[PDB]
Amino acid sequence: ELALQRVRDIMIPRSQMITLKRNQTLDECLDVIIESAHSRFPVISEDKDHIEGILMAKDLLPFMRSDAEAFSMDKVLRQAVVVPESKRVDRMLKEFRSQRYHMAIVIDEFGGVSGLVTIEDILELIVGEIEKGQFL
Amino acid sequence: ELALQRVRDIMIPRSQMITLKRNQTLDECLDVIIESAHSRFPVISEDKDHIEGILMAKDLLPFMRSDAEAFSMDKVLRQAVVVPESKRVDRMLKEFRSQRYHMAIVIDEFGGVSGLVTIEDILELIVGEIE
Numbered sequence: 529e530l531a532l533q534r535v536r537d538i539m540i541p542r543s544q545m546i547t548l549k550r551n552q553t554l555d556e557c558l559d560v561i562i563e564s565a566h567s568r569f570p571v572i573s574e575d576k577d578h579i580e581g582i583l584m585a586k587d588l589l590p591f592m593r594s595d596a597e598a599f600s601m602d603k604v605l606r607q608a609v610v611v612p613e614s615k616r617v618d619r620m621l622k623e624f625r626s627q628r629y630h631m632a633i634v635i636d637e638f639g640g641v642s643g644l645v646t647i648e649d650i651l652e653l654i655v656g657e658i659e660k661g662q663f664l
Numbered sequence: 665e666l667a668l669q670r671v672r673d674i675m676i677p678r679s680q681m682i683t684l685k686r687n688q689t690l691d692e693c694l695d696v697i698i699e700s701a702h703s704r705f706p707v708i709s710e711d712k713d714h715i716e717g718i719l720m721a722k723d724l725l726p727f728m729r730s731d732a733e734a735f736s737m738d739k740v741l742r743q744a745v746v747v748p749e750s751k752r753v754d755r756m757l758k759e760f761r762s763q764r765y766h767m768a769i770v771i772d773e774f775g776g777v778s779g780l781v782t783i784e785d786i787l788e789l790i791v792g793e794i795e
């Protein structure tokens with residue numbers, strides 16, 4: 529059943545993505561991170577169609593030490609992985625697992641950002657199927 | 665297949681739990697959290713047999729704001745959920761899902777802490793079965 533669904537069917541659409549701007553202050557970033565409670569965030573330049581990388585909330589913790597250097601986006605920004613929306617979900621899960629990451633940026637047939645997908649949503653689909661089977 | 669396993673079979677044993685002490689400073693907590701790379705931590709008093717609660721690393725972030733109050737353990741400590749070693753894993757998964765949490769403390773029949781169990785490890789069992 530995983531082999532038959534595409535990432536587009538399970539992705540978080542572009543409009544629902546919680547992102548950070550490359551030049552936002554630490555306080556603004558914190559407001560977004562704390563309010564949304566997510567762990568990872570696409571980082572954009574001007575708009576959600578231009579993703580510069582991913583920020584992981586955990587990577588902020590070292591900058592909370594009493595003697596740490598100052599935070600800067602350049603110090604924590606990681607490269608984002610991009611996948612086409614047509615990718616099969618079983619292959620997406622295999623890729624998350626083998627390459628050891630959690631979030632991909634999803635692009636459509638025109639090259640624009642159509643959303644994001646995470647390994648957690650694939651696991652949610654699997655367990656959801658478990659609970660549906662248990663419902664019937 | 666989950667119904668045939670017990671939490672004892674999949675738990676992180678007591679000796680391997682990465683914990684924080686109730687009276688640790690923010691710097692000490694950060695050292696443990698950053699080194700271990702975990703997201704959630706049992707909080708203990710004298711020893712791992714007395715769990716006072718759970719600390720979630722994300723709950724430290726509000727104290728990073730430029731105008732935030734000072735950190736203290738009392739501001740972030742969360743209540744811990746306890747389950748017996750004998751609990752069947754299908755029931756544990758149902759509980760994590762319905763109550764929407766990730767980590768439970770595992771105790772033996774005498775009241776001692778035998779370890780901790782997480783939803784991530786159950787999901788690892790499931791995905792392992794898929795692949």
Ligand SMILES: Nc1ncnc2c1ncn2[C@@H]1O[C@H](COP(=O)(O)O)[C@@H](O)[C@H]1O
Pocket residue numbers: 540544545546547565566567568569570646647648649
């Ligand atoms: N930056 C984000 N924007 C929108 N949704 C997200 C984001 N990060 C995670 N999610 C969604 O929230 C779920 C829980 O992940 P998290 O909130 O990071 O624990 C994921 O499986 C996604 O469906």
Ligand SMILES: Nc1ncnc2c1ncn2[C@@H]1O[C@H](COP(=O)(O)O)[C@@H](O)[C@H]1O
Pocket residue numbers: 676680681682683701702703704705706781782784785
């Ligand atoms: N505080 C902890 N002490 C020991 N193991 C943990 C702790 N938190 C999570 N784990 C385990 O470490 C692995 C990754 O979980 P996490 O670090 O929360 O992403 C899983 O096998 C968890 O069961």
